[PDB]
Amino acid sequence: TGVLTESNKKFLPFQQFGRDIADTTDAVRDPQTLEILDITPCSFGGVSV
Amino acid sequence: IYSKHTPINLERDLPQGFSALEPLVDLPIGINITRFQTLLALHRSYL
Amino acid sequence: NYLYRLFRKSKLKPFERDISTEIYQAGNKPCNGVAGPNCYSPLQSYGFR
Numbered sequence: 093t094g095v096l097t098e099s100n101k102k103f104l105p106f107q108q109f110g111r112d113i114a115d116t117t118d119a120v121r122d123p124q125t126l127e128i129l130d131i132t133p134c135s136f137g138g139v140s141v
Numbered sequence: 142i143y144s145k146h147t148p149i150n151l152e153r154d155l156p157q158g159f160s161a162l163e164p165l166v167d168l169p170i171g172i173n174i175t176r177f178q179t180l181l182a183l184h185r186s187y188l
Numbered sequence: 189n190y191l192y193r194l195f196r197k198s199k200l201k202p203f204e205r206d207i208s209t210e211i212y213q214a215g216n217k218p219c220n221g222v223a224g225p226n227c228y229s230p231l232q233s234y235g236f237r
């Protein structure tokens with residue numbers, strides 16, 4: 093579950109998936125359309141009453 | 142199979158620095174390989 | 189028609205096929221590719237009835 097955005101990450105042709113510093117995927121390469129979709133978790137935060 | 146092409150000057154063929162080898166061809170073979178040999182090309186002389 | 193390898197020098201590795209129809213040496217004495225005492229063929233057939 094996330095927001096898919098355009099990416100400026102120059103993926104190599106063999107590379108499909110992505111990851112970040114803590115080995116959490118930051119992007120995916122779609123098979124049907126060969127484009128890179130950056131994955132960002134949806135907005136959240138803590139509620140204090 | 143991983144490969145890389147790196148231009149080198151007139152110095153030691155195995156040069157310094159890093160040239161990472163990109164994954165080129167991942168062949169689905171499933172056979173036993175224990176020995177290998179290099180193939181060369183030779184031209185006919187015609188003389 | 190269905191045969192299994194009863195005898196081999198070492199255990200196989202994962203996803204490996206062995207089709208070599210060579211003799212096995214079960215004793216100290218070399219067998220030299222000829223059957224005889226303590227020299228048996230590795231492939232034996234199943235008795236399916």
Ligand SMILES: *[C@@H]1O[C@H](CO)[C@@H](O)[C@H](O)[C@H]1NC(C)=O
Nearest residue numbers: 108121122123124125126127
């Ligand atoms: C279908 O996917 C392949 C890659 O698996 C791609 O080359 C091709 O353009 C796609 N076809 C369509 C109509 O999107």
Ligand SMILES: *[C@@H]1O[C@H](CO)[C@@H](O)[C@H](O)[C@H]1NC(C)=O
Nearest residue numbers: 173174175200201204205206
């Ligand atoms: C491949 O063959 C050699 C000899 O032909 C054998 O010793 C070796 O165990 C084989 N590899 C595997 C994974 O069984």
